[PDB]
């Protein structure tokens, strides 16, 4: 997971007002990755390898 | 102190830039080439490898040229036509030498010549080295 944002909630308001507003809530994101592979191959000649 | 190295490891001209000379490898059980340049090159120059065998009229003169066959290695690509060749890279410097040899013997004589004779093929020199005389 990752917390992208927290958002804004609440504000200072005039006392005479009798209600309040809705803010803009934050955002959360789901992320994922991957794993990679390394490979190779090599070959020999038996007699040459044995006599070297 | 140096030695008479030519006693044990003689070398013979194989291409002087204008003509190709057959070389005898009968009495030596190993051999290889050596390449050198004398001027800046304009493009790659490929070569063909041939082998000969005893002529009919005399056992000490080579016959007509027979193109060498390819031999794929332990595991790897094979030539598009199944015949051995050597390609000299363009980047080769004047003060350097290149060495390479074929894996198989075939006939008792060997030869080499460029694919096309031109002003660029005259800038190379090829020499063959022997080893291990058997007589």
From TrEMBL, chain A:
Subcellular location: Virion
Highest taxon of source: Viruses
Protein name as catalogued: Major capsid protein
UniProtKB/TrEMBL annotation, chain B:
Superkingdom, natural source: Viruses
Name this polypeptide is given: Structural protein
């Amino acid at each position: 997971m990752k917390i992208a944002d927290y958002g804004q909630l609440g504000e200072y308001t005039c006392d005479a007002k009798c209600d309040a507003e809705f803010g803009e809530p934050g955002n959360i994101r789901h992320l994922e990755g991957k794993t990679y592979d390394y490979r190779g191959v090599f070959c020999f000649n038996r007699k040459n390898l044995q006599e070297a | 102190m140096n030695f008479n190295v030519g006693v044990d490891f003689p070398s013979f001209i194989a291409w002087d830039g204008t003509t190709s000379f057959p070389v005898k490898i009968d009495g030596f059980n190993q051999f290889g080439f050596t390449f050198k340049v004398i001027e800046e090159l304009t493009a790659d120059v490929p070569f063909n490898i041939f082998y000969h065998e005893a002529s009919e009229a005399d056992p000490c003169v080579p016959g007509p040229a027979i193109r060498v066959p390819d031999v794929p290695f332990c595991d790897g690509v094979a030539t598009a036509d199944g015949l051995a060749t050597v390609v000299i890279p363009e980047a080769v410097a004047v003060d350097s030498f290149c060495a390479g040899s074929v894996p198989c013997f075939n006939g008792p004589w060997i030869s080499i010549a460029p694919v096309t004779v031109n002003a660029d093929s005259a800038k190379v020199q090829v020499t063959v080295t022997m080893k291990g005389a058997t007589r």
